[PDB]
Design a protein around this ligand. Sequence first.
Ligand SMILES: [Cl-]
Ligand SMILES: [Cl-]
Length: 164
Amino acid sequence: MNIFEMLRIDEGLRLKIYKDTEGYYTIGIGHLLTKSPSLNAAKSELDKAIGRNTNGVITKDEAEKLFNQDVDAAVRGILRNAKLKPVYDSLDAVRRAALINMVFQMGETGVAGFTNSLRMLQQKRWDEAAVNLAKSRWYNQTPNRAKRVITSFRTGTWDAYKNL
Ligand SMILES: [Cl-]
Ligand SMILES: [Cl-]
């Protein structure tokens, strides 16, 4: 298992514009297009991201290219963030992937907001962090996914994703 496989499980793959859990226009493997309510605004961003007139539909190859860029960006966002970097550097490979997943989902700003949890992860207090991570809107809105990421931080293994 790796970050790509993990996120592919959590986000799925859709080749036509769709609405995410929050009602925002998205495509491919969780690539957010816009928070705007307009499908046209979404189609415009899509075309600009792909470089061609898509008409709201893309190919598998194109979805994977957006995905590669998005994972890369998440990683680079963590390394540039004063609050996240030190956490990321202190973690083992499985747990780093869990932090990337959260950033991919909610953005660097959002994750950096989890001050107390971050401090606990840094201290390697796994069970404590897991409980604190669960006291969040994130967990309440997307509990199944949140549980998978939380289990990864708690155990340091990929157990939550093997079977999926
Ligand atoms: Cl883009
Ligand atoms: Cl969920």
